[PDB]
Write a protein that binds this ligand. Structure first.
Ligand SMILES: *[C@@H]1O[C@H](CO[C@@H]2O[C@@H](C)[C@@H](O)[C@@H](O)[C@@H]2O)[C@@H](O[C@@H]2O[C@H](CO)[C@@H](O)[C@H](O)[C@H]2NC(C)=O)[C@H](O)[C@H]1NC(C)=O
Ligand SMILES: *[C@@H]1O[C@H](CO[C@@H]2O[C@@H](C)[C@@H](O)[C@@H](O)[C@@H]2O)[C@@H](O[C@@H]2O[C@H](CO)[C@@H](O)[C@H](O)[C@H]2NC(C)=O)[C@H](O)[C@H]1NC(C)=O
Ligand SMILES: CC(C)(C)OC(=O)N1CCC[C@@H](CNCCOc2cccc3c2ccn3S(=O)(=O)c2ccccc2)C1
Ligand SMILES: *[C@@H]1O[C@H](CO[C@@H]2O[C@@H](C)[C@@H](O)[C@@H](O)[C@@H]2O)[C@@H](O)[C@H](O)[C@H]1NC(C)=O
Ligand SMILES: *[C@@H]1O[C@H](CO)[C@@H](O)[C@H](O)[C@H]1NC(C)=O
Ligand SMILES: *[C@@H]1O[C@H](CO)[C@@H](O)[C@H](O)[C@H]1NC(C)=O
Ligand SMILES: *[C@@H]1O[C@H](CO)[C@@H](O)[C@H](O)[C@H]1NC(C)=O
Ligand code: NA
Length: 526
């Protein structure tokens, strides 16, 4: 029931899972609360406590703006924080198998949400199934988001940037110093995350300070080379200064600006974050990763291209309809409550939404490459094209390009294409296999029979869970016992990938070849 850590004792709680037992430690602090004069600073080491810390409920989520477009709708609200927002939010969770394992592989989850939102306490991130079923240890942490986690005055340690990434780093550090006491093997740590969490994972592969803190990496629908993932030094300052003007904190001394932003209430910072950009969408990564010179020593496209990253195996993948979720947050003619048949004029209006600072020719080039129809009279043509545009540009092609470049330096890489639409999916059918809806299969929620997933979904999650765990444990995402399709390595010549679905698991090649030649070779020029 009680584990002694380097900083003090913590008490867990027993959970009944599938006729077995999992020990959860929910809400272990891993840093000094980044409060007062610590706001905007890198996270500070925690002083010991003398009592027994009670880790029996999730801690506070970090301060963040909430998705409000669909009040009462489970499809959006399942992603909103489900614990109190507070700046006092630097906590982590541990699920260990019962009985206490001897030398168990550790899985460390990093949530996404644009670097502006998200929390480790969400139901779909519940690591008790992985601990029960595969006897791995699951760790997840809260990390600062938005301006409070990523506001940047580069060089200035009062606000250097990438704080939330250093939050993540300090938690991986905690697992190294402490996870052996829980029965974990610190020499066998696999990072996994989704969306901005997957982008985070890839930045840890790049950051020298994280290289000794994990073994392997899993990137679900995200990588640092995605266009939303890294803010420029120009942008980051313009955004910091714009936040300052918006809060009356403009000063000539940059340090005085920070001190001024320290005396504002969390809510005034949050209210003004959306408006630091003029191209202002609910899907703006207003404050995100930057080249700080500490976490990130150089522009990550350069480090990737020239082989400057941790050499290890990666598991990378994407969902079939990455882009559809984002169309109901602004694109004209779209609704989750109808089939969103849009016209040519509405499609073009959508490109202006999602490509705000792009030339007319750039937008026409997108229209040209995506509107050469197999049948021009099919009314869903423009609706599905805009979805593919947003998903190929923002997720599928950056992940493929990341996998190609990473594997060219000699490491094994495995790529998947997830094409199963959850039977319990509350969004309409036109949105397909949505961004974020593999997560529940990965965490094994379909393994609970009471949760009214189908039998085929239980088997798909069970196979996925096995492959994730075999990858974490052995660097090889096979399922070796149930005459499963063998998952080949992804090589930049042949570019083989594995499809994930309830019917047949297939090996295909060159996912989205035509679309990604456009996005990776032509569009960066425009
Ligand atoms: C850099 O920032 C300036 C200033 O941003 C404005 O003020 C902030 C407090 C916030 O409210 C933003 O939404 C504002 O736009 C940007 O300059 C503005 O640009 C728009 C059009 O691009 C124009 O209509 C405004 O009048 C401009 N305001 C000022 C004060 O110049 C600028 O576009 C940003 N980007 C770059 C590259 O400079
Ligand atoms: C699908 O719905 C959109 C959104 O309109 C809203 O949501 C509906 C479900 C319903 O509750 C309406 O009362 C709402 O207005 C429709 O987009 C609107 O279309 C009309 C007419 O074309 C236009 O006047 C509005 O400006 C549009 N609103 C936008 C673009 O935000 C769309 O037409 C619907 N399409 C189908 C095929 O049903
Ligand atoms: C939470 C996860 C990541 C699992 O799933 C989703 O978020 N969705 C699924 C359906 C509900 C919606 C929830 N989101 C709320 C606000 O969270 C964000 C703000 C800002 C930029 C964000 C996000 C999220 C991605 N980004 S983004 O990758 O940078 C991007 C930006 C612009 C165009 C395309 C992609 C959406
Ligand atoms: C920590 O928890 C101790 C034991 O509490 C036991 O477990 C919790 C979940 C409750 O169900 C409680 O009724 C049980 O006795 C407490 O005795 C102790 O006071 C707690 N410490 C702090 C600082 O809150
Ligand atoms: C755990 O495994 C590592 C190698 O992966 C080994 O060096 C270490 O001593 C092991 N600890 C145990 C078995 O307690
Ligand atoms: C104001 O600027 C001075 C030098 O320009 C420097 O001490 C620091 O950045 C600011 N002063 C304080 C007390 O923070
Ligand atoms: C393999 O098949 C058996 C049934 O024959 C099933 O009970 C088990 O869960 C499957 N294992 C995996 C890893 O899919
Ligand atoms: Na081309």
């Amino acid at each position: 029931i009680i584990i002694a850590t380097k900083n003090g004792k913590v008490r867990g709680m027993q959970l009944t899972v599938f006729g077995g037992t999992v020990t959860a430690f929910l809400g272990i602090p891993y840093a000094q609360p980044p409060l007062g004069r610590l706001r905007f600073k890198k996270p500070q080491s925690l002083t010991k406590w003398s009592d027994i810390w009670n880790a029996t409920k999730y801690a506070n989520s970090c301060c963040q703006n909430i998705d409000q477009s669909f009040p009462g709708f489970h499809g959006s609200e399942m992603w909103n924080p489900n614990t109190d927002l507070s700046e006092d939010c630097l906590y982590l969770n541990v699920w260990i198998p019962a009985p206490k394992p001897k030398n168990a592989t550790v899985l460390i989850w990093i949530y996404g949400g644009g670097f502006q939102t998200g929390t480790s306490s969400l139901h779909v991130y519940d690591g008790k199934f992985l601990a029960r079923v595969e006897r791995v240890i699951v760790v997840s942490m809260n990390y600062r988001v938005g301006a409070l986690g990523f506001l940047a005055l580069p060089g200035n340690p009062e606000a250097p940037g990438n704080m939330g990434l250093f939050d993540q780093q300090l938690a991986l550090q905690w697992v190294q110093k402490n996870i052996a006491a829980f029965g974990g093997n610190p020499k066998s740590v696999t990072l996994f995350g989704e969306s901005a969490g997957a982008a985070s994972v890839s930045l840890h592969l790049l950051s020298p300070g994280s290289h000794s803190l994990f073994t392997r990496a899993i990137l679900q629908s995200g990588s640092f080379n995605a266009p939303w993932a890294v803010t420029s030094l120009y942008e980051a300052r313009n955004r910091t200064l714009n936040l300052a003007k918006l809060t009356g904190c403009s000063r000539e001394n940059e340090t005085e600006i920070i001190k001024c932003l320290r005396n504002k209430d969390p809510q005034e910072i949050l209210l003004n974050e959306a408006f630091v950009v003029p191209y202002g969408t609910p899907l703006s990564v207003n404050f995100g990763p930057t080249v700080d010179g500490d976490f990130l020593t150089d522009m990550p496209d350069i480090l990737l291209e020239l082989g400057q990253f941790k050499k290890t195996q990666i598991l990378v993948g994407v969902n079939k309809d990455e882009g559809t979720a984002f169309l109901v947050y602004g694109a004209p003619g779209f609704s989750k409550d109808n089939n969103s048949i849009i016209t040519r004029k509405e499609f073009q209006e959508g490109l202006k939404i999602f490509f705000p600072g792009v030339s007319e020719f750039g937008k026409e080039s997108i229209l040209f490459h995506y509107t050469d129809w197999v049948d021009d009279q099919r009314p869903e043509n423009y609706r599905e094209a805009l979805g593919d545009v947003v998903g190929d540009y923002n997720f599928i092609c950056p992940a493929l390009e990341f996998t190609k470049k990473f594997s060219e330096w000699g490491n094994n890489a495995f790529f998947y294409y997830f094409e199963h639409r959850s039977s319990k999916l509350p969004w309409p059918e036109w949105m397909g296999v949505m961004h974020g809806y593999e997560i529940e299969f990965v965490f094994g929620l379909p393994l609970e029979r009471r949760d009214q997933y189908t039998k085929a979904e239980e088997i798909l999650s069970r196979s996925i869970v096995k492959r994730w765990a075999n990858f974490a444990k052995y660097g090889n995402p096979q399922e070796t016992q149930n005459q499963s399709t063998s998952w080949p390595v992804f090589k930049s010549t042949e570019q083989k990938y594995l499809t994930l679905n309830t019917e047949s698991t297939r090996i295909m090649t060159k996912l989205r070849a035509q679309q990604c030649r456009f996005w990776t070779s032509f569009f960066p020029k425009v």
